[PDB]
Amino acid sequence: LSLYYKKIREQLGHELIFMPSVAAVIKNEQGELLFQYPYWSLPAGAIEPGETPEEAVIREVWEETGLKVQVKKQKGVFGGKEFRYTYANGDKVEYIVVVFECEITSGKLKKLQYFSFSEKPPLALPYPDKIFL
């Protein structure tokens, strides 16, 4: 939770915050997909104002996984009521997520686990299977 969103939350109480975000689809040499376990999730995060969606996904992937990646292709933008989430404490948020297929260029992998498409775990957010293909 960056200082920007943290500051907005302070001022809005539990009210709905619209959060532009990015999520990454990362595959290793053998075709497995990288997921994170806090439901499991794709490496993802909020876009900081000032960053392009591409810069955001590269940064988020580095922070969440330790991998340095470059953007291969955009796999769609998802949003609406199905991407609305209300924290246990009452804080309401709605995401609009830009999904990017990214390729690893450097780094290491800091739970983080690879899963083949057929074995992929369930995700909280309703991303269509097409983002993986």
Q: Where do the structural domains in the chain lie, given as residue ranges?
A: 1-133
**Resolution in A, one decimal?**
1.8
* Rounded CA separation 67/77 (Å): 23
Amino acid at 29: E
Hey, what CATH topology would domain 1-133 get?
Answer: Nucleoside Triphosphate Pyrophosphohydrolase (3.90.79)
- Name the nearest CA neighbour of 21 among 81, 94, 123, 97: 97
Is the Cβ–Cβ distance between 107 and 67 less than 8 Å? yes
**How far apart (Å, rounded) are the C-alpha atoms in residues 90 and 78?**
23
List the structure tokens of 113.
Answer: 């686990």
d(CA 99, CA 14): 27
126 sits in which H/E element = none
In the PDB record, what is the listed experimental method? X-ray
**Strand runs (DSSP E) across 1-133, as ranges?**
17-26, 33-36, 44-46, 67-78, 84-86, 92-107, 112-115
